[PDB]
């Protein structure tokens, strides 16, 4: 299969040829999306959510798919992103494997999966595909565009390329571009996959594939997403309660393997490579002829208000990167609320510490309403 | 060669039947060591140095091996560990592959390398072997025992099991036992090696072997031995200078360059054994176990100690060095605890001699 599509997924076909930033174009492509909450008469209460690398469009549960979403505590009736007030639209990023066209999808020209024939993917492509999706749904201007992690990059690209499409912006643990450490981490993750003989140069298809490499990729990621101190605090030196050479012995090891399995079981290796690479290549200030680099690009955006948050313990996208986003948007006239979160959950905080990330989001949206 | 032995290495043979903590024994085994500086007539100026996992006995350059040592700036005439004052004895840890008996060494019973038949290794074994080495050299009491990183664990095990062997102690970024984060990191490092098809269940032969896996192990280590913040402010997003999904950034080339140097001089199996030993050690299990780790520390007989750690160390967090200082102090030792404000993280004791050297020099000046 290689594609893991939520049962209530809906799709917007990307008409004819969808040109990709680094060359080539996609034909017969589509974007999977899901909505939560009612769109009002003026169609001015829509909120687009661009996800992290591993997410899908099922941000929250619904009657037609009661399974909890990846942001179940953040999106819903009476929640931080209140669906009683907003029409939330969440899209699976182009290049992914949860419904939107990606490497695991069928190429109409061959009848087979794209695999590594998929055009190099750029954050800008994800943004452009999301913009088309919102417009295809009859929305000309979003009340807000929300982006977290990789989605924070996608959101900035959308604001720079489609300035009239969003009134406000919520940026959670994002960045204008990747710094060396995070690049090194993703490099090792991709290495774990490419070093697995099961990858077969991307032609694993229905075989087991580089499952070993995927597990490791996820473990390395998880270890970098939350503070070392929190890890020591959550597991200590506790041995596995389950009680043959050099195998796992500590609960922390069992914990990592358990979650690594779930990821490896629901993600396409090639899709992972493309998305990971896109994160390393994105650079908001790199082109267009405007000048000033990233700060300049942020200043030229047209959002009226913005909420920018980051975790003090985040080592993937350090707090300073979120502050840079806030400063640039403010330099351009936006009314920006910046909030550093004192959480031990690092980069994963926007997902696992909604107790802390939620209230500020609710506060901001109450002003936008 | 399976072993990477410094040319000026000397050896002390371990008694046949040397008992390993987790079972089994060693026969025809030995410990490789090197010395720097002269021992005085009274034999009261000896300083033992227990190294980090990747080190060897060549702490500094010498006439019979001018190659720079792993602690070149720390050990020598007029340096922090002044060889004009001390007879420095540095030993290669048991289980390593730089001279001391380990997985890559020849098992006298078979005439072939031990490979995975080497008995499971414990920090306590490294300590016992080092203790035998010191005594074999006719030294009844060291002026000081220095331990860094893994060596910090080894040194504590030595102080606990052989209390009359050392007068003072210098503990650099050590711990009484490993915390979860470091265990997870080492687990992944070992995984990178065992996942490499070239490992062959430890029966790899001459030529590469699980080289790619060894490279990954070292890269993951380097990425955790230093502050993530320090990384971002050293390479930026510069691409590789020399012209699917391969490396592109200078930070990647840097990691690969240094990782290869490691893979070229370390035995995979030896690495696995040493790494595992670090996860298994718990100073609290010793001496009846009364009072756990703090109790063991208080029961030690050192008179003075210098305990240092890096504020940015995430493998052996500062709290662990504070624990060592408190335990030793609670037991009567005159302890000097110094948190170092450095961005070098765990590797600080190796790369930031500017901040680690003065304190060590001052402490030893008092011990002199």
Curated annotation (Swiss-Prot), chain B:
One of its GO terms (cellular component) is cytoplasm. It catalyses: L-serine + acetyl-CoA = O-acetyl-L-serine + CoA; L-homoserine + acetyl-CoA = O-acetyl-L-homoserine + CoA. The active site is at 149 (nucleophile), 313, 346. Residues 46-351 form the AB hydrolase-1 domain. It comes from the Bacteria. Involved in the biosynthesis of the antibiotic D-cycloserine (DCS), a cyclic structural analog of D-alanine, used as an antitubercular agent. Catalyzes the transfer of the acetyl group from acetyl-CoA to the hydroxyl group of L-serine to yield the activated serine, O-acetyl-L-serine. It prefers L-serine over L-homoserine. This is L-serine/homoserine O-acetyltransferase. It comes from Streptomyces lavendulae. The gene is dcsE.
